[PDB]
Amino acid sequence: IVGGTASVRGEWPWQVTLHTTSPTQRHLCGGSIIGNQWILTAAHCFYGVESPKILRVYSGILNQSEIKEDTSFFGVQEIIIHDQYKMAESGYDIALLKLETTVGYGDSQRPICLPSKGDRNVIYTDCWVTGWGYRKLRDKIQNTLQKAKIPLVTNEECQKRYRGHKITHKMICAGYREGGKDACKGDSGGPLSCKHNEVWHLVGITSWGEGCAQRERPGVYTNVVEYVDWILEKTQAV
């Protein structure tokens, strides 16, 4: 996160750190708890991930230093990538992780609400991007979970900023016209959380952008509202 601030423990209880174990264990992507066995994240995180066996999901983490060999995690039983996904820049950058065990909910870990299909027309004024990603392009994974309040950008305005790309209504953009606050390397897969009527909603999934928090280069997020039926299809299968 560029131009971010240290989060308070339990500020974002749906935020998870997804680690890979190959060749060595390290943070790979962010993710969000959406159900007691479900993590919503980005499809691009799994490039070259041959097996769910190398994945570890940690919930209730503020600091990466809380993670050692003795720290408990959730194993991933299945990786479900949208089958229209080719690349982040083309959309469908969404994936589900089915966990091997059930997440117990508490003040340290709980799910975020998906946005309502009825609320597809509402305007979110209190949106935050979170993660352990870089503070600038040439940086490193941060110990403490960072947060940044960023305004949503219209599709029309986002499309002007990305000449050469096709910004669809399945994408949602965010960032200040002047830059300075946004996602960066290692934040992808994480949530773009918006508070509406005292309830936090998973409005987006950190996906892609040209550089980190550059002037007139807003962050591009998977527009979760457009995938609620796909999420329900995969998580409520009979």
Ligand X SMILES: CCOC(=O)[C@H]1CCCN(C(=O)c2cccc3c2CCN(C(=O)/C=C/c2cc(Cl)ccc2-n2cnnn2)[C@@H]3C(=O)Nc2ccc(C(=O)O)cc2)C1
Q: Give contact residues for ligand X (rule: CB under 6 A).
A: 26, 29, 44-45, 47, 133, 140-141, 182-188, 206-209, 211-212, 219-221
Q: Which run of H or of E encompasses 157?
A: helix 155-161
Nearest approach, Cβ of 46 to ligand X (angstroms)? Answer: 8
User: Cα-Cα-Cα-Cα dihedral of 191, 5, 173, 29, to 10°?
Assistant: -40
Q: Which is nearer to ligand X, 74 or 221 (CB)?
A: 221
Catalytic residue among 7, 59, 188, 207: 188
On whether 58 is known to bind a ligand per the annotation, the reply is no
**Residue 189 burial (CB count, 10 A):** 31
Q: Report how far residue 216's alpha carbon sits from residue 28's, in angstroms, rounded to the nearest whole number.
A: 27
Q: Report how far residue 157's alpha carbon sits from residue 119's, in angstroms, rounded to the nearest whole number.
A: 21
Q: Report how far residue 98's alpha carbon sits from residue 79's, in angstroms, rounded to the nearest whole number.
A: 7
On whether 85 is known to bind a ligand per the annotation, the reply is no
On whether 160 is known to bind a ligand per the annotation, the reply is yes
- Beta strand 199-208 with 152-153 is unpaired
The encoded tokens of residue 200 equal 């936090």
Nearest approach, Cβ of 104 to ligand X (angstroms)? Answer: 28
Known catalytic residue: 169? no
Known catalytic residue: 93? yes
Three-state DSSP state, 16: strand
Maximum CA pair distance of the chain? 49
Known catalytic residue: 188? yes
Instruction: Name, in order, each residue with C-beta under 8 angstroms of 107's C-beta and a sequence gap of 6 or more.
Output: 10, 13
Q: Which is nearer to ligand X, 37 or 208 (CB)?
A: 208
Strand partners, 206: 221
Catalytic residue among 19, 27, 44, 196: 44
Nearest approach, Cβ of 10 to ligand X (angstroms)? Answer: 24
Q: Shortest Cβ contact with ligand X: which residue?
A: 209
Q: Which is nearer to ligand X, 98 or 185 (CB)?
A: 185
Is 198:166 a contact under the CB 8 Å cutoff?
no
Q: Which is nearer to ligand X, 115 or 218 (CB)?
A: 218
Q: Which is nearer to ligand X, 49 or 110 (CB)?
A: 49
The encoded tokens of residue 163 equal 């000449």
Nearest approach, Cβ of 153 to ligand X (angstroms)? Answer: 11
Catalytic residue among 93, 187, 196, 207: 93
Nearest approach, Cβ of 4 to ligand X (angstroms)? Answer: 13
On whether 163 is known to bind a ligand per the annotation, the reply is yes
Binding-site positions for heparin read 160-163
**Active site residues per annotation:** 44, 93, 188
Q: Residues marked as binding? A: 160-163
